[PDB]
Structure formats: C-alpha cells, structure tokens
Design a protein around this ligand. Structure first.
Ligand SMILES: *Cc1cc2c(cc1C)nc1c(=O)[nH]c(=O)nc-1n2C[C@H](O)[C@H](O)[C@H](O)COP(=O)(O)OP(=O)(O)OC[C@H]1O[C@@H](n2cnc3c(N)ncnc32)[C@H](O)[C@@H]1O
Ligand SMILES: O=C(Nc1cccc(OC(F)(F)F)c1)Nc1ccccc1CCO
Length: 453
C-alpha cells in the first residue's frame, strides 16, 4: 500500500531535526497509507539478514537524532478518512481514535468541529505528533491536574519490532501499552491512539504576574497545583532577566464557556487575591481557546520572519524534585546562567497524576518541577551552539555535584551506565525485558542510542 522514496528533499528532512546537530541519513523514507504498510516494512526489517534500522518520524522535533535511522528506513508518519469522536457510557466520557502521525493542532480542529470536544492535557506547541509526544509524556500547564498526555489515552494500536499489529490498553496486553507510553519508541510504532476528550471551553482568561522573590514564586506555584473547588486550569512559569536581578513570571489561565462567563471575573479575582505576586504586575488577555492553545505557533511565525527558527536548538529539560528547587535557583538561574536567546520555563506537577506502570521516568518525590532551558544558538554561528552546550553540561554537573535527584525529560544519554542511572535498577530491568520481547533485534528508534542489535 505504501511507497519507498529516495527523493533528496525527503532524505534531507529525515536526516535532520529541530536540534539541528544530529544528521544520521537513512537509505530511504517510507510513506505508509495505513497501519498494515508500517507492519510490512517493520516485518521485512525483522526478517532481513542485516536487520536494518526503522524509525518513525513525527514532525521532526527531536533535539538529538532520536527519530533518525542511520542507513535504514525513516517512516514519514505525517498525513484519508478520520474517525469521529465517540461517547462511551462505560467510560463516562468521550474519546477519539487518531492516526499515530496526526499533529495535535489537527486533532484539536477535528474534535472541535465534531461536537466542540477537545483533549484535556496538552503540550505548549501543537505542531507535534500524537505518537511522538505519547513516546515521551506530552507536558504543559494542565499536567498538574490531568496528568501528562500519556495519562489521557485509553488504547493504542502498536506495530512491534517483529512487525506484529497489537491492540493494547490497561485491560488488553497492558505490558505493551504501559511500555510504549513514555517508551522512547523502543517497543513499537503507534499507528492509532484513542485520546480522552472533554467538552471544550470556548474562551480563556490568560494571566501573567511578576515576582522578585523565588521562595514566594515557588510557594504560590505549589499552592496553585494543590487546588481546590476553585482552581486555575493551567499553571506555568518562566524566568525573566531584569531588562526588557532575576524576575519570575507566574502564568495561569481560567477556562470558561457561555454558562461560566458570569462567574469567570470573580473566580479569577478570588484566586489572585490569595497569591503574593508584586502589586501592579498582573497582565490579562481574553481570547478563544484555540488561539490560546496555538500561542507558540504565533511565536514560531515571528521567528521564521527573522530567520531565527532554522537555527540549532540545544534544548535541555529537567525534572527537579521540589525539595531541591530552592538550591536550583541559587546555583543555576543566579549562578550558571547569571549574566543567543530563548525562554527558561519552570513549574511544578503532581506525581500521582503519572501512572507508575508507564516507561516515563520522574523523580522519586510527590511534587517535582519541569525546568525547560529552551535556548537557541545564533544563526550560522557554531560557537554560539558550543557555548550553550557548555552551559547545559554546567547545569548537569551542578545537579550531579550537589546530589539533586533530577531526571532528564526527552533524555539525551549516550552511555549504557548513563541509561542504567536514568532508569534505576528496577525500571532498567522492566525496560530491557520489554525490549527482548517486543524489539529483540533493536530495529526501532535506534537514534535514542539505548540498545544495539
Ligand atoms: C520542537 C519542539 C518540541 C516540543 C515543544 C515545542 C517545540 C518547538 N513543546 C513541547 C511541550 O510543550 N511539551 C512537551 O512535552 N514536549 C514539547 N516538545 C518536545 C516534543 O514532545 C518531542 O520533540 C517529541 O519527540 C515529539 O516530537 P515529534 O512529533 O516531532 O516526534 P519525533 O521527534 O519525530 O520522534 C521522537 C521519538 O519518537 C519516535 N516516534 C515518532 N513517532 C512515533 C510513533 N508514531 N510511534 C512510536 N514512536 C514514534 C521517534 O522515532 C523518536 O524516537
Ligand atoms: O517548547 C516549549 N514551549 C515553548 C513556549 C514558548 C516559546 C517556545 O519557543 C519556540 F521557539 F517558540 F518554540 C517554546 N515547551 C517544551 C519543550 C520541550 C519539552 C517540554 C516543554 C514544556 C515546557 O512547558
């Protein structure tokens, strides 16, 4: 049903990612029409004498070649008839079946136009694939309450490293289901995901407030994620330099529709009155739900206009235990980064919203932060990338040297002992046994660099 391509433009795209450093080239790009085509190509890789590398590519947003298949085949999962959202009296809510390669922006537009429904857990940027985010976690300001996107999926169709098509969920083949979720593409290619949906809000009251005190900023973020009961629907934060001394910006939203429109003003005021931000630093925006969710695509268009999008992105994302966040500000925000461009995001989440059976690796603490260092190197300036990479290593060295039990989100580890350390003994054993069962020849997502044939 599908086709192998050797088009130079296809080979070039499959040989690069948003990180802009890793450049491992495949022999061909596979364009599947349906799941059976993906199964055929993986089956052929498993049956071949050589056992060539096969990796699915979502939207190519990896930082360090995780979707690259050196001298093998890259499956271009990008987009056919779409399934309509479905109501279930047994689940007590809606769901939608989507193709693994579908972009979250296309999922949103589809579900809104078919019943005004939408996923309840997001990423900040919607031009990412469903299979791509579900293989990591999929995190944004809703995760503290709904959990990440891996906690908002009922079922999957997975093409294993043996080319077998398996339907899995908590009740059917749970080992494969939980293994694949946060699994870094190690156990199969997601061809279908059954996404949980809620009736979508119509509008968003988007708030930002400034802080000069890190203890008050984090104390307010930790109180907000423990609510209610009156609560915000989104809790994020970011670090700001004195020009435009360190400032911290709290970012929150209150979702509303036609029914709740008359209570949104007082709900926001009651919640904000209980906080400790700097007086006269509250900024507010009122806009449609789709416009708020697509806010990063707008930042993207302004960057493409300045030739500042197709630059190297040495991004570093860390999960930091809440017990060590104060030390982190002193040593990193004030220390390492004290004194190319890019935001530094920071906000806490609740570990109980993360299913411990999945492959995702979080710190061993109930409340932990995501600290996202989203810095870009200067265009056509290799020394800018090098200096940023040295700063990232200084951040990891700081965590190592002070015993902060941080974990990398989207891990960029190379060595086997680095992966052993990342997972820990119990999780590593579970991970390796799943690999022996579902991808014994290490064909899938070899660009992650965890296993070898
Ligand atoms: C570039 C970027 C990334 C990003 C983001 C904003 C931008 C500009 N904002 C994020 C956010 O708010 N929250 C979050 O959790 N992540 C965010 N990211 C990172 C993003 O999630 C990752 O880059 C992730 O890899 C998804 O991106 P993408 O869809 O482009 O996938 P990929 O890079 O090609 O593949 C990543 C790994 O997954 C495997 N893969 C890909 N598709 C599948 C399927 N269908 N099944 C199984 N495995 C799959 C790849 O082989 C690779 O190992
Ligand atoms: O990339 C983002 N968010 C984002 C927000 C505003 C501007 C952004 O910079 C960009 F260049 F416009 F993409 C990125 N988040 C992300 C990235 C990787 C891993 C996890 C996250 C979630 C942090 O909230």
């Amino acid at each position: 049903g599908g086709r192998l391509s050797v088009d130079a433009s296809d080979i070039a795209e499959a040989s690069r990612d948003f990180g802009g450093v890793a450049r491992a080239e495949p022999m061909a790009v596979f364009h599947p029409r349906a799941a059976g085509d993906v199964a055929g190509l993986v089956g052929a890789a498993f049956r071949s004498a050589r056992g060539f590398r096969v990796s699915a590519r979502g939207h190519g947003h990896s930082i360090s070649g995780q979707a690259q298949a050196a001298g093998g085949v890259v499956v271009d999962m990008s987009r056919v008839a779409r399934a309509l959202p479905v109501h279930s009296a047994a689940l007590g809510g809606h769901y939608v079946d989507v193709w693994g390669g579908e972009l979250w922006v296309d999922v949103l537009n589809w579900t809104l136009s078919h019943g005004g429904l939408a996923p309840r857990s997001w990423t900040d940027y919607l031009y990412l694939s469903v299979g791509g985010t579900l293989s990591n976690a999929g995190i944004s300001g809703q995760a503290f309450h709904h959990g990440p996107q891996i906690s908002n999926v009922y079922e999957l169709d997975v093409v294993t490293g043996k080319g077998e098509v398996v339907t899995c969920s908590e009740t059917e083949n749970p080992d494969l289901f939980f293994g694949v979720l946060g699994g870094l593409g190690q156990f199969g290619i997601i061809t279908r995901a059954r996404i949980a949906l809620e009736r979508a809000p119509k509008r968003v009251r988007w708030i930002r407030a400034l802080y000069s005190n890190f203890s008050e900023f984090t104390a307010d973020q930790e109180r907000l994620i423990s609510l209610g009961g009156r609560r915000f629907d989104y809790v994020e934060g970011f670090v700001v330099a004195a020009e435009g001394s360190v400032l911290y910006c709290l970012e929150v939203t209150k979702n509303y529709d036609d029914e709740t429109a008359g209570s949104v003003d007082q709900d926001v005021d009651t919640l904000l009155g209980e906080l400790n931000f700097l007086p006269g630093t509250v900024f507010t925006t009122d806009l449609p739900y789709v416009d708020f969710l697509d806010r990063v695509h707008k930042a993207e268009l302004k960057l493409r206009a300045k030739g500042m999008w197709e630059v190297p992105h040495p991004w570093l994302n860390l999960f930091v235990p809440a017990s060590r966040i104060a030390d982190f500000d002193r040593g990193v925000f004030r220390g390492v980064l004290g004194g190319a461009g890019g935001p530094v995001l920071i906000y806490p989440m609740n570990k109980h919203k993360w299913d411990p059976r999945s492959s995702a690796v979080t710190p061993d603490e109930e409340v932990f932060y995501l600290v996202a260092f989203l810095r870009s190197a200067l265009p056509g300036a290799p020394e800018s990338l090098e200096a940023l990479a040295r700063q990232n290593q200084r951040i990891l060295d700081f965590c190592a040297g002070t015993g902060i039990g941080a974990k990398q989100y989207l891990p960029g580890h190379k060595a086997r002992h680095e992966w052993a350390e990342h997972f820990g003994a119990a999780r590593w054993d579970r991970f390796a046994r799943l690999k022996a069962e579902f991808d014994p020849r290490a064909i899938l997502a070899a660009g992650q660099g965890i296993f070898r044939p």
